[PDB]
Amino acid sequence: ELDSHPYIAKWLDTEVVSLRLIDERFYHLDTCFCPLSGGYLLYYPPAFDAYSNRVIEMRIPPEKRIIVEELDAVNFACNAVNVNDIIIMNLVSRTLKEKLAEAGFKVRETPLTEFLKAGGAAKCLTLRVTEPILATVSIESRVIRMEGHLLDAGILNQALDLVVENSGSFRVLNFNLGVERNSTSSAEVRVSAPSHQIMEEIMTELIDLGAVPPPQELCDINTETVTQGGVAPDDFYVSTIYPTEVRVNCEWVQVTGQRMDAAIVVTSNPPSARCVLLRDLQVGDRVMVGVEGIRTIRVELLVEQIAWEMRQIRDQGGKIVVTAGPVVIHTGGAQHLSHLVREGYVHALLGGNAIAVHDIEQATMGTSHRHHLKIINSVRRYGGIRQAVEAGFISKGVMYECVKNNIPYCLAGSIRDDGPLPDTEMNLVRAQSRYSELIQGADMILMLSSMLHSIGVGNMTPSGVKMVCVDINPAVVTGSVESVGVVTDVGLFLSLLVRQLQQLT
Amino acid sequence: DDIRILMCPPDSSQERAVEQWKKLHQTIKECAIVDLVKPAKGWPDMVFTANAGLVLGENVVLSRFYHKERQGEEPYFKAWFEENGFTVYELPQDLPFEGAGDALFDREGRWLWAGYGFRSELDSHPYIAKWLDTEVVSLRLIDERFYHLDTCFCPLSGGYLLYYPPAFDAYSNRVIEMRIPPEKRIIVEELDAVNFACNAVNVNDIIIMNLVSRTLKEKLAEAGFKVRETPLTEFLKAGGAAKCLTLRVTEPILPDVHATVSIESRVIRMEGHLLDAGILNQALDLVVENSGSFRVLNFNLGVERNSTSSAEVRVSAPSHQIMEEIMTELIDLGAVPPPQELCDINTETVTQGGVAPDDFYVSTIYPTEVRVNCEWVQVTGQRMDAAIVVTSNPPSARCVLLRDLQVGDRVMVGVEGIRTISERRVELLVEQIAWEMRQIRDQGGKIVVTAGPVVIHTGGAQHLSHLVREGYVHALLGGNAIAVHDIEQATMGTSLGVDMGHRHHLKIINSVRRYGGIRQAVEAGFISKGVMYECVKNNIPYCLAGSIRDDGPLPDTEMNLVRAQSRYSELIQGADMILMLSSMLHSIGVGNMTPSGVKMVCVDINPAVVTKLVESVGVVTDVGLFLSLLVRQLQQLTR
Amino acid sequence: DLQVGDRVMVGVEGIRTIKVSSERRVELLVEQIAWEMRQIRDQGGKIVVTAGPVVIHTGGAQHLSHLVREGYVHALLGGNAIAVHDIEQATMGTSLGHRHHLKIINSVRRYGGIRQAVEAGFISKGVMYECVKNNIPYCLAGSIRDDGPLPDTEMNLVRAQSRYSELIQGADMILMLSSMLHSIGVGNMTPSGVKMVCVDINPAVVTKLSDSVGVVTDVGLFLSLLVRQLQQLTR
Amino acid sequence: VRRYGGIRQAVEAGFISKGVMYECVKNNIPYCLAGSIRDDGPLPDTEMNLVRAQSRYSELIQGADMILMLSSMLHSIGVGNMTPSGVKMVCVDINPAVVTKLVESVGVVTDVGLFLSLLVRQLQQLTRPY
């Protein structure tokens, strides 16, 4: 256990450098690790996680590192007994012996295979009692509390799994149980991490879904000002989707314009804080740093539930935006999506070049390297689709129904785009700006089969919104709490949805 | 001896709301006496009087709201009840019940339907039953749209039941169907259901409801009901309709009726790593998903860093056999009864050959002990999907297949007395599996391989043959197809009419039939190499199970599948690992025959087809690639 | 089956032969298949259906039951699993944890078979119920995975193959509700000229030749569409 | 990487010591990063104007004899739309429907990392008689 390492140092007045073992075959340090004299280290890197390997490499120069191949490692080559000039080990590779001889060590091999059949080689059979004397600990310790139904949800298990997988340790204090489901039972846990940076990293993921510091230990937040334009301080806090409050001047400030993968900029005289993209960051902006002071907070039945939710939100609830791809057209879904636009179920459209050319082809030429260039060229002639709708060339379809009922749409470009329609942006910074604009204030977003595209749109969306993602593969099914995904054909989903919303309101 | 109904007036939208309440007020005024209660400012949802409580005769059970938003109405309603001579009963502050919205009497008065699942508690149904002295039939609501019983359930006079089955789980539907005959069921279609058609008031033959489909109204009229529609959409905006806006105070009394409850309550204890693994959470989810309820009594933690935790849970279930199912599912995860409640196991004698008494316990994969004659007896021959037969004179307990049950055997019954004691970077799983196989091979342990024709099609014949040579295969379970494909690739250098209904298949099969089996065909130098060759040469027991697809079977292929299942269980015994390289059907059967202690390696290229109840490891790759990597890694333990 | 002294043709001399989709396209294929089925039913034509438990898992029990009821199914080829799951859905309204399976099997074993359990009022609905009621020949081939089995499932597979070949004889169409093992075995038993309808949600539609038609949808959804379209050549 | 102002600068400073981009900068191999609506942050190198990116793609594709397409479905169709017929197209993926590109083009249905490992091994067995 990591929590044993502070004891060791305290009892021995020594420094303890912690390494996390990840390989079940080498559960003992002396089965994959052998410090040698002359600054040489014989070890098997795959037995340690990325952080521990980084520590080892930071401490040992490349001229001093002896990596073993997998064959040696599985033969317990590192389980070797070392006298200042002698290294005693089991049978090892000839190439390993040559590298070992390159250092001032002379290899003496002896068979211990019978013990290797029980987990130990030569080093396991010894304990060095004369260790030389030629107290420090890297571990960081904290107790945190989480207020939620820890039993009626996987809150503790997901938290502790996060801790361990991020190369930390934990200890659950006494569980305080409530009288009833209304009295939430909550507990505080000790969280340890070998590095300051790893403690910080654990805390960010841990800070998500509550995990507040004890009431007495911290009500401040740290910030650093932006010195380079379009850059951020190295330790800038990375924002998540979930709603966040930050403690500025001992007061809680809600962050405006919440988006994931952004920086949090705080102003003092106007005490608010806002999310800002790295590229949009201006010089002299104060970006939050560290983790201190932040706090958070079925065949067809699924279609029935989504339809009920759509009826709910349609009654003057909030903007509904639909992200569409050409798969919507390929599967016979043009008319149903158009009907959704007509009946006021679609308040904005996010798509691309392909879906527009395919919809307009289905409307103009039927047919329930191709003709598209003829269609694309025709649309280029009018200078855009809206103009093409005002003329008698496009009378029906998804784009037609969006233009007539005046639904805002944005066609983001892609490297795959065939000579683009005039409406397609093709400058992707402008496209992201318009995308975030059109997403504003939405309560539900229909995501119709564009995994790269839908994930890109979702990352732009705040946490509170409920999302439906449809594809025939479980690949384009990302998720989050509010949002459920469908494994049907997007055209079938649209047909069922239009039917269920029909005669209902 | 009359009909009395309590209502409450609502003191852009709101104008229509007032009018609609008045419209409803008079309609019920035409059929019954309408008592009013004074509204309160700050409690607008007080108009839904059905949630005030539940009245039978002179006793009223005041409602205990689940959420805080409507709890403030509880006192004022209580006041009304006390002012009119009712004996008010209150539930524990922890025990929610939302009144006549979740408890509807059968119109004849035989029993009370009561819902649980969202806002009302199962553990409250005994309280209601005792306090009103009536029978309570428990139904679990599963649809969040209908979180109240009176939005999907409407008992009508004449023995009729107007309800929406999709709002109930399978058990509740079974109960409803058991009690109400099909001629008396008026199923509601979904469109009506979402418009609260079941939120209807029925006096004698009159049914007062909001606006519904013509088809539902005609279906109602055929049964003899006269529908009176009134607009209530404003209240529909608040999840209320005609039934919600009323509370019937004069309910019929059948003096022959007393309190009755099907609910069973039990306490269980769970010791162990309930914090990390999340076993306690899995237990509670198991309870709820099987239509039960719980209250965690004691969570006692052992030593506070990483020691074992122990806990007490009260488990309630609406049916005895729902308790049985819940208890089996819990017992698979420890869950012993409290030490003072420990009973022994009950048995029943076998009257029909190869048939068991219905209440017999179904065995699982996990090793079990049963308490026979006040002693813990370890169960022998552990297999899932079997019966446990106990002997009295010596202390034994064994798992036996249903067909093997002999007359006069004592088979366990009930639940009392039982305890349970495409992806890449595959090479990491291959390293772990190779090391574990080396461990099991060095010490004296059986490794069994179940193979299918995919082994040959993907180029794995030679590697599996090497595995057989180096003593890694102690039994082989396969079928006709893999044997004919292996021998075809060995003889003609091609399986499935291509490089390893073609004619090579039949020619190979025909030759092997000429020799009378594969062993003879090996002795006459006809099969010189392959998986079957190495099995015969190094004398590894194999069993080729038949299939309905089998082409003119090889003499070795067992076409009697009871014999094949017996032989499969024989070869599987004492195994430490099972390498499963085949289709599911073969692998699922071999798994159904193996106990939990055995290590399972399941390899297949379908990502969804790698599903096995960690003790089992699954890989989603090409089986030939897995075999090549495994052979290489196992050599690195010899080279 | 070769008996001693039989003269078997040899060589090549003297022998001659007179011989996942979108729901939009699925409904067109279903229209074509439904029309062919109506044509074959309106004459004295035989339709044989091979079913697997997937029919039950996807909510297709009711639709297959309707097809058997309305005379579209003249023989049923299946196994232990499909029968136990059909009977479980009929009795308890669910299917597939494992416990409910054995109790059903035990119950059926107590009656000694599906027919006994039908006349004794234990099975009131389902595919097996409609087969027993409407006198449809069925054969349940055994598998090594079989629990129980049910008294009806033939655990000796030479006997089962014989019964399969018997039920296949007069066929004009074979509805394959894909059990890959079952579908390949029944296909190897069927001659040419017969129309093969193979339905699966997998690209397991490796169906050799048209002589037929394969569909890549949900088998329950396929059955729903087929029953809907067939109830339009009945109005 | 934005602070260093680009991938080349971050390599020349010593923040990027290994990798595909490191080897591309070191051996002076031209690369082009087309932008996407999903981009969480543009590397200074990522071209966010897709007409310029398409022009640069056609430039870098010119005179090519083979195109190894490694698990960019969106990119693979566009680059193929840019490529003439004479070039051999190697398209590798597990989907396997995105392997349907149409003897002058080869499609492979596997995991791209395994494909690369096997390719390096075979190219060793071909260019390492030493």
Side-chain angles (χ1 to χ4, degrees), chain B residues 313-320 322-323 326-339 342-344 346-358:
Chain B
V313 185
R314 184 182 305 271
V315 170
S316 314
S319 156
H320 175 68
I322 291 292
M323 175 74 57
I326 298 179
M327 279 309 304
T328 320
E329 290 277 76
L330 291 169
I331 289 176
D332 297 1
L333 295 65
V336 64
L342 187 147
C343 178
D344 293 342
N346 307 321
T347 288
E348 293 201 31
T349 205
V350 181
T351 74
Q352 202 162 348
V355 169
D358 296 7

Short mmCIF file of all heavy atoms in Angstrom, two decimals, chain B residues 313-358, unseen atoms left out:
data_model
loop_
_atom_site.label_atom_id
_atom_site.label_comp_id
_atom_site.label_asym_id
_atom_site.label_seq_id
_atom_site.Cartn_x
_atom_site.Cartn_y
_atom_site.Cartn_z
N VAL B 313 -29.49 -5.51 5.90
CA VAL B 313 -30.49 -4.97 4.99
C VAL B 313 -31.82 -5.66 5.26
O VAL B 313 -31.86 -6.89 5.37
CB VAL B 313 -30.09 -5.16 3.51
CG1 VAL B 313 -31.10 -4.47 2.59
CG2 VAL B 313 -28.68 -4.64 3.25
N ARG B 314 -32.89 -4.89 5.37
CA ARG B 314 -34.24 -5.45 5.35
C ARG B 314 -34.70 -5.51 3.90
O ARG B 314 -34.60 -4.51 3.18
CB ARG B 314 -35.24 -4.64 6.18
CG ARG B 314 -36.62 -5.31 6.23
CD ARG B 314 -37.66 -4.52 7.01
NE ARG B 314 -37.24 -4.19 8.37
CZ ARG B 314 -37.46 -4.97 9.42
NH1 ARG B 314 -38.09 -6.13 9.28
NH2 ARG B 314 -37.05 -4.59 10.62
N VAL B 315 -35.19 -6.67 3.47
CA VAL B 315 -35.63 -6.88 2.10
C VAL B 315 -37.11 -7.23 2.11
O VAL B 315 -37.53 -8.15 2.82
CB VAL B 315 -34.81 -7.97 1.40
CG1 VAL B 315 -35.44 -8.34 0.06
CG2 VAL B 315 -33.37 -7.52 1.20
N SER B 316 -37.89 -6.50 1.32
CA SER B 316 -39.32 -6.74 1.19
C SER B 316 -39.62 -7.12 -0.25
O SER B 316 -38.95 -6.66 -1.18
CB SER B 316 -40.14 -5.50 1.60
OG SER B 316 -39.67 -4.94 2.81
N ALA B 317 -40.62 -7.97 -0.42
CA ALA B 317 -41.01 -8.45 -1.73
C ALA B 317 -42.52 -8.63 -1.71
O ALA B 317 -43.07 -9.07 -0.69
CB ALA B 317 -40.33 -9.77 -2.10
N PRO B 318 -43.21 -8.30 -2.81
CA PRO B 318 -44.68 -8.38 -2.76
C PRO B 318 -45.19 -9.80 -2.74
O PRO B 318 -46.27 -10.04 -2.18
CB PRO B 318 -45.09 -7.64 -4.04
CG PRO B 318 -43.96 -7.90 -4.98
CD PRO B 318 -42.71 -7.94 -4.14
N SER B 319 -44.47 -10.75 -3.33
CA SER B 319 -44.90 -12.14 -3.38
C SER B 319 -43.86 -13.02 -2.69
O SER B 319 -42.67 -12.69 -2.66
CB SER B 319 -45.10 -12.61 -4.82
OG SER B 319 -44.97 -14.02 -4.92
N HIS B 320 -44.33 -14.14 -2.12
CA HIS B 320 -43.39 -15.12 -1.59
C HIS B 320 -42.40 -15.58 -2.65
O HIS B 320 -41.21 -15.70 -2.38
CB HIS B 320 -44.11 -16.34 -1.01
CG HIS B 320 -43.16 -17.42 -0.58
ND1 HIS B 320 -42.30 -17.26 0.49
CD2 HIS B 320 -42.89 -18.64 -1.10
CE1 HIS B 320 -41.56 -18.35 0.63
NE2 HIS B 320 -41.90 -19.20 -0.33
N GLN B 321 -42.89 -15.87 -3.86
CA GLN B 321 -41.98 -16.35 -4.89
C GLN B 321 -41.14 -15.22 -5.49
O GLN B 321 -40.03 -15.48 -5.97
CB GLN B 321 -42.76 -17.03 -6.01
N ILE B 322 -41.59 -13.97 -5.36
CA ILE B 322 -40.70 -12.86 -5.66
C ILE B 322 -39.59 -12.79 -4.62
O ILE B 322 -38.43 -12.55 -4.95
CB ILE B 322 -41.50 -11.54 -5.74
CG1 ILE B 322 -42.41 -11.53 -6.97
CG2 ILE B 322 -40.56 -10.35 -5.77
CD1 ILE B 322 -41.67 -11.48 -8.29
N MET B 323 -39.94 -13.02 -3.35
CA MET B 323 -38.92 -13.18 -2.32
C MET B 323 -37.96 -14.31 -2.64
O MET B 323 -36.76 -14.19 -2.41
CB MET B 323 -39.57 -13.38 -0.95
CG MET B 323 -38.57 -13.66 0.16
SD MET B 323 -37.65 -12.21 0.69
CE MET B 323 -38.97 -11.11 1.18
N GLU B 324 -38.48 -15.43 -3.15
CA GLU B 324 -37.61 -16.55 -3.52
C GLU B 324 -36.60 -16.14 -4.57
O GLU B 324 -35.39 -16.42 -4.44
CB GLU B 324 -38.46 -17.73 -4.00
N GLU B 325 -37.07 -15.49 -5.64
CA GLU B 325 -36.16 -15.06 -6.70
C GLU B 325 -35.13 -14.06 -6.18
O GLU B 325 -33.92 -14.19 -6.44
CB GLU B 325 -36.95 -14.46 -7.86
N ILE B 326 -35.59 -13.05 -5.44
CA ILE B 326 -34.69 -12.06 -4.85
C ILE B 326 -33.65 -12.74 -3.96
O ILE B 326 -32.47 -12.38 -3.97
CB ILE B 326 -35.49 -11.00 -4.06
CG1 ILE B 326 -36.43 -10.23 -4.99
CG2 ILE B 326 -34.55 -10.03 -3.36
CD1 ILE B 326 -37.26 -9.19 -4.28
N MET B 327 -34.08 -13.73 -3.18
CA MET B 327 -33.18 -14.35 -2.22
C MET B 327 -32.14 -15.21 -2.92
O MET B 327 -30.99 -15.25 -2.50
CB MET B 327 -33.98 -15.18 -1.21
CG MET B 327 -34.61 -14.37 -0.09
SD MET B 327 -33.45 -13.28 0.76
CE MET B 327 -32.19 -14.45 1.27
N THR B 328 -32.52 -15.90 -4.00
CA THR B 328 -31.53 -16.63 -4.78
C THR B 328 -30.49 -15.68 -5.36
O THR B 328 -29.27 -15.91 -5.25
CB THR B 328 -32.21 -17.42 -5.90
OG1 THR B 328 -33.43 -18.00 -5.41
CG2 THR B 328 -31.31 -18.55 -6.40
N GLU B 329 -30.96 -14.57 -5.95
CA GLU B 329 -30.04 -13.60 -6.53
C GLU B 329 -29.12 -12.99 -5.48
O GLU B 329 -27.95 -12.70 -5.78
CB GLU B 329 -30.83 -12.51 -7.26
CG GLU B 329 -31.51 -12.97 -8.54
CD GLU B 329 -30.58 -12.98 -9.73
OE1 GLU B 329 -29.74 -13.90 -9.83
OE2 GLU B 329 -30.68 -12.05 -10.57
N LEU B 330 -29.61 -12.79 -4.26
CA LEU B 330 -28.74 -12.28 -3.20
C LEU B 330 -27.77 -13.35 -2.71
O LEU B 330 -26.58 -13.06 -2.50
CB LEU B 330 -29.57 -11.77 -2.02
CG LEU B 330 -30.42 -10.51 -2.15
CD1 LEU B 330 -31.33 -10.40 -0.94
CD2 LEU B 330 -29.54 -9.28 -2.27
N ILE B 331 -28.25 -14.59 -2.53
CA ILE B 331 -27.41 -15.67 -2.02
C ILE B 331 -26.21 -15.90 -2.92
O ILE B 331 -25.13 -16.25 -2.44
CB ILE B 331 -28.24 -16.95 -1.81
CG1 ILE B 331 -29.18 -16.77 -0.62
CG2 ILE B 331 -27.35 -18.15 -1.55
CD1 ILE B 331 -30.11 -17.94 -0.40
N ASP B 332 -26.36 -15.67 -4.23
CA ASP B 332 -25.19 -15.81 -5.09
C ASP B 332 -24.06 -14.85 -4.71
O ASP B 332 -22.92 -15.04 -5.15
CB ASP B 332 -25.55 -15.62 -6.56
CG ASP B 332 -26.51 -16.67 -7.07
OD1 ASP B 332 -26.90 -17.55 -6.29
OD2 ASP B 332 -26.84 -16.63 -8.28
N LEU B 333 -24.35 -13.83 -3.90
CA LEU B 333 -23.36 -12.84 -3.48
C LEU B 333 -23.23 -12.83 -1.96
O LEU B 333 -23.30 -11.76 -1.34
CB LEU B 333 -23.74 -11.44 -3.99
CG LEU B 333 -23.78 -11.10 -5.48
CD1 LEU B 333 -24.85 -11.86 -6.26
CD2 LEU B 333 -23.99 -9.61 -5.65
N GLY B 334 -23.01 -14.00 -1.36
CA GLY B 334 -22.98 -14.13 0.09
C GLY B 334 -24.40 -14.09 0.64
O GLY B 334 -25.16 -15.04 0.45
N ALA B 335 -24.75 -13.00 1.32
CA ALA B 335 -26.11 -12.77 1.83
C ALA B 335 -26.62 -13.93 2.69
O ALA B 335 -27.50 -14.69 2.29
CB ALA B 335 -27.07 -12.49 0.67
N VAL B 336 -26.03 -14.07 3.87
CA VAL B 336 -26.46 -15.13 4.78
C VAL B 336 -27.53 -14.49 5.67
O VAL B 336 -27.48 -13.28 5.91
CB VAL B 336 -25.28 -15.68 5.60
CG1 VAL B 336 -24.68 -14.61 6.53
CG2 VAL B 336 -25.62 -16.98 6.33
N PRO B 337 -28.51 -15.24 6.17
CA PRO B 337 -29.47 -14.67 7.12
C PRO B 337 -28.78 -14.31 8.42
O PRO B 337 -27.67 -14.80 8.69
CB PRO B 337 -30.50 -15.80 7.33
CG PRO B 337 -29.84 -17.04 6.84
CD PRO B 337 -28.90 -16.61 5.76
N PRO B 338 -29.37 -13.44 9.24
CA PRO B 338 -28.72 -13.06 10.49
C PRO B 338 -28.45 -14.28 11.35
O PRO B 338 -29.26 -15.22 11.35
CB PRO B 338 -29.73 -12.12 11.16
CG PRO B 338 -31.03 -12.36 10.46
CD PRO B 338 -30.67 -12.77 9.07
N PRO B 339 -27.33 -14.31 12.07
CA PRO B 339 -26.88 -15.56 12.70
C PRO B 339 -27.92 -16.23 13.58
O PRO B 339 -27.87 -17.45 13.76
CB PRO B 339 -25.64 -15.12 13.49
CG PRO B 339 -25.19 -13.85 12.83
CD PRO B 339 -26.46 -13.18 12.40
N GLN B 340 -28.86 -15.47 14.13
CA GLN B 340 -29.86 -16.05 15.02
C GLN B 340 -31.05 -16.60 14.25
O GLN B 340 -31.85 -17.35 14.82
CB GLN B 340 -30.33 -15.00 16.03
N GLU B 341 -31.20 -16.23 12.98
CA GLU B 341 -32.33 -16.61 12.15
C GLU B 341 -32.04 -17.83 11.29
O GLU B 341 -32.94 -18.34 10.62
CB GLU B 341 -32.76 -15.44 11.26
N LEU B 342 -30.78 -18.29 11.29
CA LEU B 342 -30.33 -19.43 10.50
C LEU B 342 -31.25 -20.63 10.68
O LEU B 342 -31.41 -21.14 11.79
CB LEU B 342 -28.90 -19.80 10.91
CG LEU B 342 -28.17 -20.87 10.09
CD1 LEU B 342 -26.68 -20.56 10.05
CD2 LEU B 342 -28.39 -22.27 10.65
N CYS B 343 -31.84 -21.07 9.58
CA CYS B 343 -32.63 -22.29 9.54
C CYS B 343 -31.90 -23.33 8.69
O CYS B 343 -30.89 -23.04 8.04
CB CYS B 343 -34.03 -22.02 8.99
SG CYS B 343 -35.08 -23.48 8.83
N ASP B 344 -32.42 -24.54 8.70
CA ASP B 344 -31.91 -25.62 7.87
C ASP B 344 -32.71 -25.68 6.57
O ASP B 344 -33.70 -24.97 6.39
CB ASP B 344 -31.96 -26.95 8.63
CG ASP B 344 -30.99 -26.98 9.80
OD1 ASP B 344 -30.07 -26.14 9.82
OD2 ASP B 344 -31.16 -27.84 10.69
N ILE B 345 -32.27 -26.54 5.67
CA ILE B 345 -32.87 -26.60 4.34
C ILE B 345 -34.03 -27.58 4.36
O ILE B 345 -33.98 -28.62 5.02
CB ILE B 345 -31.82 -26.99 3.29
N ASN B 346 -35.07 -27.24 3.61
CA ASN B 346 -36.24 -28.08 3.43
C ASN B 346 -36.11 -28.89 2.15
O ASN B 346 -35.49 -28.45 1.18
CB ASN B 346 -37.52 -27.23 3.38
CG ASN B 346 -37.64 -26.29 4.57
OD1 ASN B 346 -37.31 -26.65 5.69
ND2 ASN B 346 -38.12 -25.08 4.31
N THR B 347 -36.69 -30.09 2.17
CA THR B 347 -36.64 -30.97 1.02
C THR B 347 -38.02 -31.56 0.76
O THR B 347 -38.91 -31.53 1.62
CB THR B 347 -35.63 -32.11 1.22
OG1 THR B 347 -34.30 -31.60 1.13
N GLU B 348 -38.19 -32.09 -0.45
CA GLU B 348 -39.40 -32.78 -0.85
C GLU B 348 -39.00 -33.99 -1.68
O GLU B 348 -37.99 -33.97 -2.39
CB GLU B 348 -40.35 -31.88 -1.65
CG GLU B 348 -40.95 -30.74 -0.84
CD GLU B 348 -42.23 -30.21 -1.46
OE1 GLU B 348 -42.95 -30.99 -2.11
OE2 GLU B 348 -42.50 -29.00 -1.31
N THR B 349 -39.81 -35.04 -1.60
CA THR B 349 -39.48 -36.29 -2.26
C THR B 349 -39.97 -36.27 -3.70
O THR B 349 -40.98 -35.65 -4.03
CB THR B 349 -40.09 -37.48 -1.51
OG1 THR B 349 -39.33 -38.66 -1.79
N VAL B 350 -39.23 -36.97 -4.56
CA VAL B 350 -39.50 -36.98 -5.99
C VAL B 350 -40.56 -38.04 -6.28
O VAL B 350 -40.33 -39.23 -6.08
CB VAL B 350 -38.21 -37.25 -6.79
CG1 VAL B 350 -38.50 -37.23 -8.26
CG2 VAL B 350 -37.16 -36.21 -6.46
N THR B 351 -41.73 -37.60 -6.76
CA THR B 351 -42.80 -38.52 -7.10
C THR B 351 -42.75 -38.97 -8.56
O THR B 351 -42.99 -40.14 -8.85
CB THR B 351 -44.16 -37.89 -6.80
OG1 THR B 351 -44.46 -36.90 -7.79
CG2 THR B 351 -44.16 -37.23 -5.43
N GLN B 352 -42.45 -38.05 -9.47
CA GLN B 352 -42.32 -38.36 -10.89
C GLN B 352 -40.85 -38.50 -11.26
O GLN B 352 -40.02 -37.71 -10.82
CB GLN B 352 -42.98 -37.28 -11.74
CG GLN B 352 -43.37 -37.73 -13.13
CD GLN B 352 -44.39 -36.81 -13.78
OE1 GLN B 352 -44.98 -35.95 -13.11
NE2 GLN B 352 -44.60 -36.97 -15.08
N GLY B 353 -40.55 -39.48 -12.10
CA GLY B 353 -39.17 -39.72 -12.48
C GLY B 353 -38.64 -38.61 -13.37
O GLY B 353 -39.25 -38.26 -14.39
N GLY B 354 -37.49 -38.05 -12.99
CA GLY B 354 -36.89 -36.98 -13.76
C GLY B 354 -37.62 -35.66 -13.71
O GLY B 354 -37.35 -34.79 -14.54
N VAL B 355 -38.54 -35.49 -12.76
CA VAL B 355 -39.24 -34.23 -12.54
C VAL B 355 -39.05 -33.86 -11.08
O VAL B 355 -38.94 -34.73 -10.21
CB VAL B 355 -40.74 -34.35 -12.93
CG1 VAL B 355 -41.55 -33.15 -12.46
CG2 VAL B 355 -40.89 -34.54 -14.43
N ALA B 356 -39.03 -32.56 -10.81
CA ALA B 356 -38.83 -32.05 -9.46
C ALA B 356 -40.07 -31.31 -8.99
O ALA B 356 -40.86 -30.82 -9.80
CB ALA B 356 -37.62 -31.11 -9.42
N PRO B 357 -40.28 -31.22 -7.67
CA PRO B 357 -41.35 -30.36 -7.16
C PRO B 357 -41.08 -28.92 -7.57
O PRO B 357 -39.94 -28.46 -7.60
CB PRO B 357 -41.28 -30.56 -5.65
CG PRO B 357 -39.92 -31.09 -5.38
CD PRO B 357 -39.55 -31.90 -6.59
N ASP B 358 -42.17 -28.20 -7.89
CA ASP B 358 -42.05 -26.88 -8.49
C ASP B 358 -41.19 -25.92 -7.67
O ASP B 358 -40.35 -25.21 -8.23
CB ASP B 358 -43.44 -26.30 -8.72
CG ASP B 358 -44.25 -27.11 -9.72
OD1 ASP B 358 -43.78 -28.19 -10.13
OD2 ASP B 358 -45.35 -26.65 -10.10
#
